[PDB]
DNA sequence: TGGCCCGGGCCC
C-alpha cells in the first residue's frame, strides 16, 4: 500500500515569487523546515475545543533565503509579500545561481531518506515553480530522489474524516482549527511555521496520509519552459 | 496555469 515506504523526514516548503504562473514568476524568497517523523509523532494529542497551537519540535533544521529575481514583481505580489526586485538587488541578494543549488543539496543530504516535501497548494504552484528554477540551472536537480505532497489535499482528507462550502486556504485552515490569526502572512518563514502548525493538528493521521500519497518530485510537471 | 467542485472563483 506504500509506494515509497515510510517518509523519514518531512520538509515543509513555501515559495515567494514575482507574480502568478501567467507572469512567468521567479522565486524571490525560499524557506524550508526539515522535521523528522518522530518529531511530529511526538506532538501531544490536541486537547479541548478549540485546541491550542502546537509548539514546533525542538529538533528542527531551518533554512530561509531571499533570492533576487530577474524580473520585477507584480503589483499584487510586492504588495502582500513585502518584497521587491529593486530592494533585493540593493541589499546585494544573489540570483538563483548554481551556488544556491549546492546549498539546497547539502541541506537535503543532512536529512534522513526517504524525504518528502510539504507545501500548501504545492502540487500546482510551489513544486512546478521550483522545478523550473532548478531546470534553468545546469546543476542537476537535488530533488531527483526527494518526494513531495500537497497539504491542501491532505487537510481536505483530515477534515472530512474527523467531521462527516469550506475554504481550504492556508489562512482559513489555520483559523478554523485554532481560532487564531496567522502571524506574518505571505512571508516564506511565516507561512511554513503556519503550515507546520496546521500539520501538527493530527500528526499521526498526517504521517499516515503522507506515506500513501508521496510521489517523486521528478514527476512534477514544470510551470513553464 | 492547471485542477477542484456547486462554467466561473478558488488556492504570488
Ligand atoms: Mg505557497
Ligand atoms: Mg507563500
Numbering used by the authors: 5 to 168, 174 to 234
Which sentences did the original study use to describe this structure?
In contrast, the electron densities of the 2 short 5′-overhang were not as continuous and weak, suggesting that the 3-nt-long 5′-overhangs were disordered. The structure of the TREX1-dI-T-dsDNA complex vividly illustrated the mode by which TREX1 broke the last base pairing in the duplex region. In particular, the Leu24-Pro25-Ser26 cluster acted as a wedge to chisel the duplex end formed by the last G-C pair and the dI-T wobble pair, and the DNA adopted a Y-like structure. The complex of TREX1-dI-T-dsDNA hence provided a first structural basis for the ability of TREX1 in unwinding the duplex region of dsDNA. In addition to the Leu24-Pro25-Ser26 cluster, the structure indicated that the narrow pocket of the TREX1 active site was also involved in breaking the double-stranded structure as Leu24 and Ile84 stacked with the last nucleotide at the 3′-end. Furthermore, the last nucleotide at the 3′-end of the substrate formed several hydrogen bonds with Glu20, Ala21, and Tyr129 in the narrow pocket. These couplings to the 3′-end would thus facilitate unwinding of the terminal base pair. The dsDNA of the TREX1-dI-T-dsDNA structure was further labeled with γ-32P and analyzed using 20% denaturing polyacrylamide gels to confirm that dI-T-dsDNA was indeed intact in the crystal.
Three prime repair exonuclease 1 (TREX1) is a member of the DEDDh family of exonucleases and accounts for most of the 3′–5′ exonuclease activity in mammalian cells. Anchored in the plasma membrane of the endoplasmic reticulum (ER) through the C-terminal domain, TREX1 degrades a variety of substrates to prevent initiation of autoimmunity. TREX1 is, in fact, unique in the DEDDh family for the activity of dsDNA degradation, which enables its participation in preventing autoimmune responses and in restricting retrotransposons. In this work, we solved 4 X-ray structures of TREX1 with representative DNA substrates to delineate the molecular details of the multifaceted catalytic properties of TREX1.
